[PDB]
Amino acid sequence: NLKVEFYNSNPSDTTNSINPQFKVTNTGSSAIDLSKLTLRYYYTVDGQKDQTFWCDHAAIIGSNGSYNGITSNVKGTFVKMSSSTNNADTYLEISFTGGTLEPGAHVQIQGRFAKNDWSNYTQSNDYSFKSASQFVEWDQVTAYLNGVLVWGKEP
Amino acid sequence: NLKVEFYNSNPSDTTNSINPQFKVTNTGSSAIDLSKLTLRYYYTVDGQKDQTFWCDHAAIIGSNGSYNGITSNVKGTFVKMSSSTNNADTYLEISFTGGTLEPGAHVQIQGRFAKNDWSNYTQSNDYSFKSASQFVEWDQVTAYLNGVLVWGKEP
Ligand SMILES: [Ca+2]
Ligand SMILES: [Ca+2]
Numbered sequence: 602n603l604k605v606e607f608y609n610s611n612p613s614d615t616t617n618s619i620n621p622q623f624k625v626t627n628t629g630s631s632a633i634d635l636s637k638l639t640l641r642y643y644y645t646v647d648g649q650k651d652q653t654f655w656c657d658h659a660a661i662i663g664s665n666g667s668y669n670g671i672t673s674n675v676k677g678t679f680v681k682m683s684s685s686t687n688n689a690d691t692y693l694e695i696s697f698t699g700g701t702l703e704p705g706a707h708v709q710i711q712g713r714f715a716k717n718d719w720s721n722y723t724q725s726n727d728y729s730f731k732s733a734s735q736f737v738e739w740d741q742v743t744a745y746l747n748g749v750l751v752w753g754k755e756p
Numbered sequence: 757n758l759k760v761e762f763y764n765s766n767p768s769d770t771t772n773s774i775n776p777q778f779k780v781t782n783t784g785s786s787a788i789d790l791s792k793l794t795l796r797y798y799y800t801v802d803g804q805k806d807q808t809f810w811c812d813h814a815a816i817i818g819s820n821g822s823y824n825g826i827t828s829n830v831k832g833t834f835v836k837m838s839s840s841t842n843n844a845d846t847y848l849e850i851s852f853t854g855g856t857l858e859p860g861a862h863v864q865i866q867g868r869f870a871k872n873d874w875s876n877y878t879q880s881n882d883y884s885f886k887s888a889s890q891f892v893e894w895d896q897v898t899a900y901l902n903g904v905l906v907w908g909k910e911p
Binding site: 681682683684685690743745748749750755 | 794836838839849900903904905910
């Protein structure tokens with residue numbers, strides 16, 4: 602059982618970097634294996650180019666406030682959709698090499714990606730885009746446990 | 757522009773091989789690049805196992821009756837759905853390495869797939885199942901051209 606909160610820290614309509622911020626909480630009674638957890642951010646690439654994802658910072662925060670830095674365990678891959686919509690033709694899929702999300706604990710991921718030539722994106726035609734000053738409950742981003750959708754609405 | 761006709765040549769409710777038969781007609785005025793066309797057959801795996809697809813026979817038939825064998829250009833892959841329904845948790849996606857479908861021409865595909873342990877399937881709970889003696893207009897199978905849905909209803 603999971604709860605996903607999210608926001609984009611870069612609100613510029615035209616920009617050369619998209620900054621997705623994820624906060625995933627294990628609201629269940631049993632621990633979660635992060636290597637089985639994947640997250641997706643849907644958008645339109647606006648000119649297909651190879652892209653790169655970077656995790657500025659990621660950490661597992663326990664229910665008692667314990668801090669475990671896992672920045673280098675977060676990986677990002679770009680998937681071109683086999684069936685697209687007018688505001689979603691590509692998605693960034695976030696994965697973890699390992700780690701355990703214990704009951705009540707949560708993981709914060711401060712992400713960022715860009716095209717390899719640093720050309721612009723347009724964020725107003727991106728399905729998952731959500732400008733906010735903090736993590737909000739947003740269902741236009743999805744989460745999966747072993748390939749099964751457990752949060753959000755796919756486009 | 758396309759038209760998809762279809763039928764299953766194996767009607768057995770319990771069986772260890774599913775036989776989808778596709779007939780795709782280029783009803784438009786311009787030729788179609790087959791490497792840009794994909795087709796889907798939705799069903800419930802009834803016990804997750806790796807699966808294999810075989811094209812028994814495939815051919816491009818021209819409006820003048822011309823015959824061009826393309827059996828080895830037809831590929832099939834199995835995709836497990838992230839979100840499933842009571843009659844769809846997996847889909848066979850059919851692709852073509854190449855070929856061009858001229859206006860008025862159609863391509864016939866006699867396919868078959870099975871689990872790698874040859875265990876049974878149940879066809880009564882499969883979204884795309886359509887038993888018939890010949891190809892019928894069926895919208896429970898989908899076709900995508902350039903990653904865009906151009907035929908059928910997805911579950
Ligand atoms: Ca965009
Ligand atoms: Ca079945």
